[PDB]
Design an enzyme around this catalytic site. Structure first.
Site, PDB file in Angstrom:
ATOM      1  CD  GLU A  84       3.451  -8.791  54.075  1.00 43.45           C
ATOM      2  OE1 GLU A  84       4.099  -9.150  53.059  1.00 43.45           O
ATOM      3  OE2 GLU A  84       3.079  -7.631  54.232  1.00 43.45           O
ATOM      4  CG  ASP A  95       0.328  -7.530  55.560  1.00 41.64           C
ATOM      5  OD1 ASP A  95       1.516  -7.334  55.938  1.00 41.64           O
ATOM      6  OD2 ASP A  95       0.109  -8.065  54.453  1.00 41.64           O
ATOM      7  CD  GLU A 134      -0.965  -3.423  54.175  1.00 47.66           C
ATOM      8  OE1 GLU A 134      -1.584  -4.498  53.977  1.00 47.66           O
ATOM      9  OE2 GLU A 134      -0.228  -2.852  53.333  1.00 47.66           O
ATOM     10  CG  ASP A 194      -0.431   3.301  44.426  1.00 50.09           C
ATOM     11  OD1 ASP A 194       0.222   3.943  45.263  1.00 50.09           O
ATOM     12  OD2 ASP A 194      -0.332   2.062  44.279  1.00 50.09           O
TER      13      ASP A 194
END
Ligand SMILES: *[C@@H]1O[C@H](CO)[C@@H](O[C@@H]2O[C@H](CO)[C@@H](O[C@@H]3O[C@H](CO)[C@@H](O)[C@H](O)[C@@H]3O)[C@H](O)[C@H]2NC(C)=O)[C@H](O)[C@H]1NC(C)=O
Length: 267
Positions: A80, A82, A84, A173
């Site tokens: 992966e 990413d 974000e 979180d």
């Protein structure tokens, strides 16, 4: 990057009614509220290529939200790549987090602030992925390089075809102030915008993990084996001025520092 309509390259996967299409799908909005976010993915799977999205992030209070644009393989021991985007209370800075998973193992987070307000205009967020390296770019600025360091015993996304994904979801979180700032659901819907939807890659089914034109692509040529000096200077500036977290220099988590770091110039 050539701008095309969403439906040429992508399909929605979740909460279809939370994706708003404008100008024939040349621009889309992803909506997030307390019941659901949304996401989409590429029709095809790719092994190497150049992948780019124009994005304009969630304005105002975006705390607790994550807008993701990423490539991922399917199986266990997944790979992966990413982007974000971690939101924030009104007038407080977005973080762009990047990460790389190889063989199911990530923990390679870097976090930067940006040199513009990413909620005010569309900017290009791109991945170049070839057999030599992965480059993460913001417009024309490289913000990270993950080199193929298999010679040092480090894994690299090398033979698992990946799909392109994007999504907008809550991540209370950990997203904002390490998880201390929670989403204010009275400020919904949170809206992220996308254009361009550019995919130029070596199409490869999960069925067969190969592309019949491998090594013959423009990104396989000699000039794409490394960044040039100008690009490395831009990268060093990101490292020196815009980086708030870098797994490479985090001695609490990596007493034993990762082998890729010196090569990637994250040192
Ligand atoms: C959302 O906005 C908040 C501010 O409300 C940002 O939090 C701030 O993050 C910076 C960079 O991590 C912190 O500054 C740094 O502090 C360390 C010491 O811990 C120091 O080594 C650095 O030189 C730098 O000054 C700052 O303390 C922190 N402030 C608060 C109140 O948490 C946050 O980064 C923004 N983005 C997200 C998604 O949370």
């Amino acid at each position: 990057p050539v701008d095309v309509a969403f439906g040429r390259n992508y399909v929605p996967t979740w909460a279809f009614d939370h994706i708003k299409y404008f100008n024939g799908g040349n621009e889309i909005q992803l909506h997030l509220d307390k019941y659901t976010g949304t996401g989409f993915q590429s029709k095809g799977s790719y092994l190497f290529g150049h992948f780019s999205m124009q994005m304009k992030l969630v304005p105002g209070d975006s705390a607790g939200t994550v807008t993701a644009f990423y490539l991922s393989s399917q199986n266990s021991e997944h790979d992966e790549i990413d982007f974000e985007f971690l939101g924030n209370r009104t007038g407080q800075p977005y973080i762009l987090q990047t990460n790389v998973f190889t063989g199911g193992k990530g923990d390679r987070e870097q976090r930067i602030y940006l040199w513009f307000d990413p909620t005010k205009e569309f900017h290009y967020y791109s991945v170049l992925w070839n057999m030599y390296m992965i480059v993460f770019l913001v417009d024309d600025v490289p913000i990270r390089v993950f080199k193929n360091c298999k010679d040092l015993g480090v894994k690299f996304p090398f033979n698992q075809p990946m799909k392109i994904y994007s999504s907008l979801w809550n991540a209370d979180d950990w997203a904002t102030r390490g998880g201390l700032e929670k989403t204010d659901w009275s400020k919904a819907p949170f809206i992220a915008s996308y254009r361009s939807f550019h995919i130029d890659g070596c199409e490869a089914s999960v069925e067969a993990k190969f592309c019949a034109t491998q090594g013959a692509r423009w990104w396989d040529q000699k000039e794409f084996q490394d960044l040039d000096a100008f690009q490395y200077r831009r990268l060093s500036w990101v490292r020196q001025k815009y980086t708030i977290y870098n797994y490479c220099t985090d001695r609490s988590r990596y007493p034993s520092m990762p082998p890729e770091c010196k090569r990637d110039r994250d040192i």
